[PDB]
Design a protein around this nucleic acid. Structure first.
Lengths: 179, 178, 179, 178
DNA sequence: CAGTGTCCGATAATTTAT
DNA sequence: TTATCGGACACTG
DNA sequence: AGTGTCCGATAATTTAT
DNA sequence: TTATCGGACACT
DNA sequence: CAGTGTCCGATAATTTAT
DNA sequence: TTATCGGACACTG
DNA sequence: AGTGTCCGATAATTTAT
DNA sequence: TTATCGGACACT
């Protein structure tokens, strides 16, 4: 019964404020609301150990507990073992029954099958972009023309890293590209 | 490279049967593995001797993992390595997205049944132990004789040599009829 | 609320007595318990029309409503339209929620996928039995040796159907087999 | 023989897009059909012009049938005839057992979402109509002029010819300001 | 004109699987 | 599935 | 004829992730 | 959803 | 003995998709 | 994904 | 040594569709 | 499940 609360975020959109907002309006106070800001899921492990027999948790929706269906279960399993139940406020399913957890784990694998496809289409769309002729990753920031002139000079490589206040390791690798 | 896996639980060793189908699929006992759950060692070994481009087989689904949870755990560890299990009875391959999903759902449901029926078994145990049924293995050793061999004033150790039976039992037997 | 009850049977094992047995112990009386003995699902159609807004039904398990997932839904859909809910006493799911019916229809298709496979293995096992050399269908009951002697006679075919008190149509077809 | 099917709902006619993929699969507009839901006639026609050994295509799953129920009804009628739909986005074929099943589950769940979100839309309509928002199409015709053309004592029919507008509306307009 | 042969569909009796 | 049972026509004679 | 009511088809609207 | 359009009716 | 070149892993900056 | 940033060795001289 | 307790591994048990 | 087996301990 003695309700807990758990939420998370992972994107540049820290939609965390929203997550919490209802966890309160449900019944549970911050005094018992846990959070990982997926930069390592620490605040979860800690929640995992604060709970005891006949506790109850609350997670906004189905994705918010675990990303990977495989261990989304492990939690629930380990959780039901202790006697703790987590509800999916958006989905409205109880870890606590059978049918509940059963249909939790049901919905997850059916929802990852969406992500798993998404990522293939995301990557297929990056392989038709890389090959098309698009610039990748991060751009050159420091003039390599300034470095190559300072090496054809026959100048000591270590000296350059403070004439141009940059990393010494990059100096070398830069010269290695143009074969 | 292709592989076969099988398992058992009951005293009814349907093991010979599972293996048969495996050979009727193309895997030899040269690449077949078995665990007689009594402790899943033989599985670990198979899980340690397959690389990318390999395919495992099990007759029934439940056969790989009874519990839905660690079932995916394997399959996950498995798809990551490059291996995939086909199930002959249900005809699903972890070699895909849906496949993997459809292994999982199947098995979740599969358990809600397994788990509810389990409860029904325990209800049946409850409605039996209360009505007056004797559980466990029934007694064998002629106790009224052992008890007559203490009443004698004989060594308890002496008993356990005279009767080809265990000594620690002898003592327990006496502290049975208070 | 005003509870109803529905059960069915289809095999030589008329396990109907059992079906009813609990439909009562649930709360509903025979006064409102319906039955088709699948010899045509009439007693269902009638139940379908006796129910009104805010009624509630009860069916032993998931198979017992409908066999074919396709219309198992139609019922539920048509049923939820009226405001009537059917429960799956063995399964413990409510037509009444969403998640309920959703997970009813979930379980059915996953359970037919069992039957659909079964029948293929049943038939595969009949095709390896027919070819193996097993007698099929129904056995000859009336001596065809007695009929063939009564036709080589040049005897009128109609006459034979009352000398041997049998069907007149079979008389003919019998002679047609031995080419 | 292979076939293509597509559909639309929104004023955002993503129709041109669905068809594109169909051609990128191998079906010509010579064997492609479309319903612009405004009434699923074009489907019926396709359902009436395929025999055994044919295969239909739709981009998304929801596209065939929105409602989970009649979705299977089609697929059932379909497997019986000898035809089967592949869905390119999800990559599932009704040409199988699991396939058919896995079409269905997918679509059931798919709806629990569709249906719950629908409710959320209606909650948003409720929290808007109560706060004080004007729904429907906004008024156009200069009523204070029509009302000034009865106050005149002019024929109502006369109005509807003078202003290039409908007559029945004229009357309704007057019984608006009691 | 009425008996002989062709051809169904609806019923009863059987099999393989659980 | 396969066997009979009622029948329905349609020609034959 | 022509003045008044009372429908359903078509247009333009809003709300929602 | 509400506003207009086409109408089709029933009465002076 | 100390400067020159090889080679990581851990961090920050970027892209494609929703 | 790709760029730098700190570093760690290991030889060279 | 040898007499008494108090564990866990192995055997034989039952209940269930 | 309860009954025996192997034991390993702590005390006269």
């Amino acid at each position: 019964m003695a309700l807990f609360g758990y939420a998370r975020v992972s994107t540049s959109q820290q939609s965390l404020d929203i997550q919490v907002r209802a966890l309160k309006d449900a019944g549970v106070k911050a005094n018992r609301i846990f959070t990982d800001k997926a930069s390592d899921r620490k605040g979860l492990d800690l929640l995992r150990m604060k709970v005891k027999e006949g506790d109850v948790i609350l997670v906004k929706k189905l994705d918010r507990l675990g990303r990977d269906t495989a261990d989304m279960i492990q939690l629930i399993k380990e959780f039901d073992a202790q006697g703790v139940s987590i509800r999916f406020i958006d989905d409205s399913i109880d870890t606590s029954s059978a049918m509940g957890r059963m249909v939790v784990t049901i919905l997850s694998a059916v929802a990852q099958a969406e992500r798993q496809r998404i990522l293939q289409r995301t990557n297929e769309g990056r392989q038709e972009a890389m090959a098309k002729g698009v610039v990748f990753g991060r751009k050159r920031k420091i003039d390599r023309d300034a470095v190559l002139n300072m090496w054809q000079q026959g100048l000591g490589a270590s000296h350059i890293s403070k004439t141009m206040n940059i990393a010494r390791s990059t100096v070398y690798k830069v010269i290695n590209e143009s074969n």
